[PDB]
Ligand binder design. Structure first.
Ligand SMILES: [K+]
Ligand SMILES: [K+]
Ligand SMILES: [K+]
Ligand SMILES: [K+]
Ligand SMILES: [K+]
Ligand SMILES: [K+]
Ligand SMILES: [K+]
Ligand SMILES: [K+]
Ligand SMILES: [K+]
Ligand SMILES: [K+]
Ligand SMILES: [K+]
Ligand SMILES: [K+]
Ligand SMILES: [K+]
Ligand SMILES: [K+]
Ligand SMILES: [K+]
Ligand SMILES: [K+]
Ligand SMILES: [K+]
Ligand SMILES: [K+]
Ligand SMILES: [K+]
Ligand SMILES: [K+]
Ligand SMILES: [K+]
Ligand SMILES: [K+]
Ligand SMILES: [K+]
Ligand SMILES: [K+]
Ligand SMILES: [K+]
Ligand SMILES: [K+]
Ligand SMILES: [K+]
Ligand SMILES: [K+]
Ligand SMILES: [K+]
Ligand SMILES: [K+]
Ligand SMILES: [K+]
Ligand SMILES: [K+]
Ligand SMILES: [K+]
Ligand SMILES: [K+]
Ligand SMILES: [K+]
Ligand SMILES: [K+]
Ligand SMILES: [K+]
Ligand SMILES: [K+]
Ligand SMILES: [Mg+2]
Ligand SMILES: [Mg+2]
Ligand SMILES: [Mg+2]
Ligand SMILES: [Mg+2]
Ligand SMILES: [Mg+2]
Ligand SMILES: [Mg+2]
Ligand SMILES: [Mg+2]
Ligand SMILES: [Mg+2]
Ligand SMILES: [Mg+2]
Ligand SMILES: [Mg+2]
Ligand SMILES: [Mg+2]
Ligand SMILES: [Mg+2]
Ligand SMILES: [Mg+2]
Ligand SMILES: [Mg+2]
Ligand SMILES: [Mg+2]
Ligand SMILES: [Mg+2]
Ligand SMILES: [Mg+2]
Ligand SMILES: [Mg+2]
Ligand SMILES: [Mg+2]
Ligand SMILES: [Mg+2]
Ligand SMILES: [Mg+2]
Ligand SMILES: [Mg+2]
Ligand SMILES: [Mg+2]
Ligand SMILES: [Mg+2]
Ligand SMILES: [Mg+2]
Ligand SMILES: [Mg+2]
Ligand SMILES: [Mg+2]
Ligand SMILES: [Mg+2]
Ligand SMILES: [Mg+2]
Ligand SMILES: [Mg+2]
Ligand SMILES: [Mg+2]
Ligand SMILES: [Mg+2]
Ligand SMILES: [Mg+2]
Ligand SMILES: [Mg+2]
Ligand SMILES: [Mg+2]
Ligand SMILES: [Mg+2]
Ligand SMILES: [Mg+2]
Ligand SMILES: [Mg+2]
Ligand SMILES: [Mg+2]
Ligand SMILES: [Mg+2]
Ligand SMILES: [Mg+2]
Ligand SMILES: [Mg+2]
Ligand SMILES: [Mg+2]
Ligand SMILES: [Mg+2]
Ligand SMILES: [Mg+2]
Lengths: 44, 91, 274
RNA sequence: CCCAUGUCCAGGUUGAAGGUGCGGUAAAACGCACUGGAGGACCGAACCCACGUACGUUGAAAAGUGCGGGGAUGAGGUGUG
RNA sequence: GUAUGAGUAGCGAAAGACAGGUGAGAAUCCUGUCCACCGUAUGACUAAGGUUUCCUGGGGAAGGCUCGUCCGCCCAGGGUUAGUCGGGACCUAAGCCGAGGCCGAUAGGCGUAGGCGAUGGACAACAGGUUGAUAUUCCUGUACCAGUUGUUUUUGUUUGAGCAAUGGAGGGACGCAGUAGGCUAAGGAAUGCAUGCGAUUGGAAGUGCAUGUCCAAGCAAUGAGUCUUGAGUAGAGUUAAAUGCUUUACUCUUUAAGGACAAGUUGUGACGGGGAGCGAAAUAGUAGCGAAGUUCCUGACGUCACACUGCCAAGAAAAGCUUCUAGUGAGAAAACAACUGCCCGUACCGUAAACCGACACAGGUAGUCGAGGAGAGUAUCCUAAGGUGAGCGAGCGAACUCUCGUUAAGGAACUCGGCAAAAUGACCCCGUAACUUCGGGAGAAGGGGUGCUGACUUCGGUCAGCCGCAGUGAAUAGGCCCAAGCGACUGUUUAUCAAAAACACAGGUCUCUGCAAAAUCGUAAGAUGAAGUAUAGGGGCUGACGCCUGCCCGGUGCUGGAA
RNA sequence: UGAAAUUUUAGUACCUGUGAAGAUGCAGGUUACCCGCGACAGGACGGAAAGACCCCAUGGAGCUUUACUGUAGUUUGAUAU
């Protein structure tokens, strides 16, 4: 029974990282929304 | 950074005292200081001659008081070995 | 020739392959090798655009000289080599000036032949000449459609075309498909026919061999679901159950022509076939 | 599913093509030995899989375990990106 | 928020016993002894992941399915040392970003140059010791790599040593399978060597018992072997040039010669270190001391080395590196001495109680090492090194349920169905049918042998004898046959009720497609098809192979025609 | 050491009958001292899941086609370039 979550530092950053979010207009929209909501952590 | 700002404080512990017996002294240094800069700063400050400098990064350590939890500040530790025929650092 | 394996195993049963007798070496030319990746039928969007492709053995690209535009000096045929990229074999040839190149190996080519290219080259297997210089009735291959572009037509193993005549600035040609068309007289071609004629007769023998050759399984539309293929669905085996069989995207699959009706090349195609 | 680049498959068994020798013939085909080591080949661990059954079924487990079961140099398993 | 069920289910695979100690309190914590368990692992390393869980000293609120004096918990201190290891200051693959550029209601999409990007290439250090916690990082010893300064020694200074391209080249540079050979680890035996001991339960001072039985990198010398023809002439090229490289003809050489590689061995590294064991106080088995380190047997797909052979499915790139000139050039080279060498990771767990599973969860987790007897073996049983006794127990030994052993006579009468279980099972020998695509069927079937002790063996046997109910005496190992349907076959499939006759398949056939091909993704640009070209590519159907595949073109499609 | 599903309150018998037509609870009669423990599963139309069968809603979704109406594409003409 291999489960869905297989941790990996590099993959987390490459997929959900701050620079990845900033590379795309929609990723920047996510960052804006997180800031507006006030999330302490806006990116992985 | 200023040479005087490079070295922050000595480290006094069982391990560091044993090191002193071998004529190597442990100092907390600015986290951005490379061991070459550390060597220059030690020489200017203490007039001794440095044989080698071994540097290592101490990770921030998790702590908690009551309802609050955080991390101690990260540190940078440098073990400086003086040459023979050199004055000792007096603390 | 074709060697038939003894039926030692059901997989090996009925299998045949080539003996590679013509092949003289197995060490390609380092200078002419190029890297190739297996696109596996996926385009820049990453979507599968051509089904049933992918996997299989790794290959290196051999830079073939389809242009044959080096007319100054003669090229001596050094070796006949297997080419993983094409059905036909290739020939490594050394030009007397020291330039190494690969060409298609015509039927009857042999090590030591001194090929030449240019208008004055004699009509010998492996020579290259502009179509205007090739006498009628000659059998040729590696025909180029535009001058200087390099041979494009008649390159598969065992294929060949025949020169039928001249007219205006064009040359009448019967292609391997039986289609007769005009081709610009300044286009070049190689005298002869592409070697390795036996290629067609190989019996692959087992599924794993197709997988080696980079063919992934083909699934019949009749055994898909309705949302997958127009033939999909129905209880049990079903007939086509439509006006005509169609591709996965509804294009009729039997007899329905697809050539563009306003093709510019109709003016040059004299007699069609296929 | 695919791409690039790595990596894994204890140990046994069988004996294809080809080759050599001797027969045989005008030359052959062909025959007999030896050699040779092919295979989605055979048996079988690791590995992968999941056919039968019992149990489990507020479980040890939101799909498993026990006993057996199939594949195991390939259309193979698997890692990293 | 609190009840009921209820002091009920459950307390999550397995062996512990006792003595002593600690302490308010002990089945559960510590110590000791015996016993037991794993041992191709439940041992030893590592990558990811986790992120302080590591060490030391305290604590017993909560967490731990019981307990707890204890813990991966809580509290306080402490712990990760690199020119050489892995990464960066090196290279590139897939893929990604992308100056200009192309395309596009907006947003943006695509892409050249150029970059990024290891899982690959390149690249200089090892042995021992030391701490409670780090070690190829610290220390001792002995090195190497890049560079700076300086001393000395040679040689060159513009008829110019030397350096040297972003340029020309070479090289890097590569698959799979198959055995064979060399070498070394590894393993085993010895009345080899060294040390220690002589047993009390009847016997043994000997061929008794136990334990050990060797050491780098670097440097030097060599080396099992492995690959490879080597010159010369005349040309032609290599955007300029070249002595380099590529190459065409022509001579001579080719059992060789020359050249390029090479595991490993010997010496030194070593007056060093380890090492059975002996063993100190002032408080341990710890300072410290410390013998021997032979021969023989087996012997690695570990290494030479993808070396050789064979095969088809035809098996990265770039840099480093080596050469060539072009350019650049007044300084160079050697030895020696001293000196310089940055950032990041380094703790600990890691077939797990520390990772993925909500749990201290019978699941999952890449790679390396992985011993002995019997054995083909990493199977199997019992063991070595090493690790562990599983975080509720004490009784009792009812039904019933589960897991397992045995079972008179019968032997499928059970049942939807021989489901389950039983039976067969290893090796050696004899022997083996229909049918067949000649390969198989086939381990068909059906039989026989297996222990121990002598003798002789051509070393595999044979002959003789002995014992038992039984000799692959345990463990681990096919049940078989006749016949029919379906599917040719190996494969694939509904993760988690269906593994099949379903899908695929090789083969067949039809049809499209002349290349800016057809087809497909996309508004487009741009892509795949394909750096392919009708013996190719796409689509439909059928589905090995063998024998065959009849009649109908009126209707519907397609194709052609054009009055 | 210590849950859970369930649970209107319950001092919670049997027969025949009655009743929304299948009663522990209603009628007549019978039986039965109070409280438990170990077992079994006939009943509580037992628990679990606002039945998936069936029907209905001018509900939903996926699919088909010579259903209706559109439409991407493909093609043909005019016209501009
Ligand atoms: K948050
Ligand atoms: K076959
Ligand atoms: K080919
Ligand atoms: K098919
Ligand atoms: K169907
Ligand atoms: K099972
Ligand atoms: K409760
Ligand atoms: K209760
Ligand atoms: K404690
Ligand atoms: K490093
Ligand atoms: K790497
Ligand atoms: K040079
Ligand atoms: K070394
Ligand atoms: K040595
Ligand atoms: K470390
Ligand atoms: K053995
Ligand atoms: K073993
Ligand atoms: K316990
Ligand atoms: K009892
Ligand atoms: K029972
Ligand atoms: K019976
Ligand atoms: K049979
Ligand atoms: K017997
Ligand atoms: K067996
Ligand atoms: K089938
Ligand atoms: K089939
Ligand atoms: K059939
Ligand atoms: K099956
Ligand atoms: K299927
Ligand atoms: K057929
Ligand atoms: K077809
Ligand atoms: K059909
Ligand atoms: K087919
Ligand atoms: K008809
Ligand atoms: K018709
Ligand atoms: K009612
Ligand atoms: K009941
Ligand atoms: K639905
Ligand atoms: Mg460091
Ligand atoms: Mg296809
Ligand atoms: Mg279906
Ligand atoms: Mg449809
Ligand atoms: Mg249908
Ligand atoms: Mg039907
Ligand atoms: Mg097989
Ligand atoms: Mg696994
Ligand atoms: Mg599966
Ligand atoms: Mg099988
Ligand atoms: Mg098998
Ligand atoms: Mg109860
Ligand atoms: Mg337990
Ligand atoms: Mg085992
Ligand atoms: Mg601890
Ligand atoms: Mg503690
Ligand atoms: Mg407790
Ligand atoms: Mg490195
Ligand atoms: Mg882009
Ligand atoms: Mg731009
Ligand atoms: Mg290195
Ligand atoms: Mg440690
Ligand atoms: Mg005695
Ligand atoms: Mg030039
Ligand atoms: Mg070997
Ligand atoms: Mg460590
Ligand atoms: Mg676990
Ligand atoms: Mg055991
Ligand atoms: Mg019986
Ligand atoms: Mg009996
Ligand atoms: Mg019966
Ligand atoms: Mg019966
Ligand atoms: Mg059975
Ligand atoms: Mg046995
Ligand atoms: Mg089948
Ligand atoms: Mg199968
Ligand atoms: Mg299923
Ligand atoms: Mg199943
Ligand atoms: Mg079919
Ligand atoms: Mg009534
Ligand atoms: Mg009633
Ligand atoms: Mg009442
Ligand atoms: Mg009621
Ligand atoms: Mg109910
Ligand atoms: Mg309802």
């Amino acid at each position: 029974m291999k489960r869905t979550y297989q941790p990996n530092k590099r993959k987390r950053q490459k997929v959900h990282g701050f620079r990845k979010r900033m590379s795309t207009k929609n990723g920047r929209r996510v960052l804006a929304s997180r800031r507006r909501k006030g999330r302490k952590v806006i990116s992985a | 950074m200023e040479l005087l700002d490079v070295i922050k404080r000595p480290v006094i512990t069982e391990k560091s005292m044993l090191a002193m017996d071998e004529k190597k002294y442990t100092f907390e240094v600015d986290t951005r200081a490379n061991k070459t800069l550390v060597k220059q700063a030690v020489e200017s400050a203490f007039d001794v001659k440095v044989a080698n400098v071994n540097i290592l990064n101490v990770r921030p350590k998790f702590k908690r008081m009551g309802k609050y939890a955080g991390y101690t500040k990260k540190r940078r530790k440098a073990i400086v070995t003086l040459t023979e025929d050199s004055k000792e650092i007096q603390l | 020739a074709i060697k038939k394996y003894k039926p030692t195993t059901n997989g090996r049963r009925n299998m045949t392959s080539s003996d590679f007798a013509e092949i003289t070496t197995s060490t390609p030319e380092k200078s002419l090798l190029q890297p190739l990746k297996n696109n596996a039928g996926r385009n820049n969007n990453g979507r599968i655009t051509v089904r049933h492709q992918g996997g299989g053995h790794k290959r290196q690209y051999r830079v073939i000289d389809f242009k044959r535009n080096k007319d100054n000096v003669a090229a001596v045929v050094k070796t006949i080599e297997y080419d993983p990229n094409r059905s036909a074999n290739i020939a490594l040839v050394h030009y007397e000036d020291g330039v190494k190149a690969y060409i298609l190996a015509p039927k009857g080519l042999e090590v030591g032949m001194r090929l030449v290219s240019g208008p004055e080259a004699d009509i010998k297997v492996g020579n290259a000449l502009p179509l205007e210089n090739i006498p009628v009735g000659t059998v040729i291959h590696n025909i180029e459609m535009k001058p200087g572009k390099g041979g494009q037509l008649i390159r598969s193993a065992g294929t060949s075309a025949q020169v039928l005549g001249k007219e205006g600035k064009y040359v009448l040609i019967r292609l391997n498909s039986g289609e007769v068309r005009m081709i610009l007289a300044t286009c070049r071609a190689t005298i002869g026919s592409v070697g390795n004629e036996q290629h067609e007769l190989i019996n692959i023998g087992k599924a794993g061999r197709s997988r080696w050759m980079r063919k992934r399984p083909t699934v019949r539309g009749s055994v898909m679901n309705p949302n997958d293929h127009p033939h999909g669905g129905g209880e049990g085996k079903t007939p086509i159950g439509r006006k005509a069989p169609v591709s996965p995207w509804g294009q009729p699959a039997i007899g329905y022509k697809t050539r563009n009706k306003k093709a510019k090349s109709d003016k040059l195609i004299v007699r069609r076939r296929t």
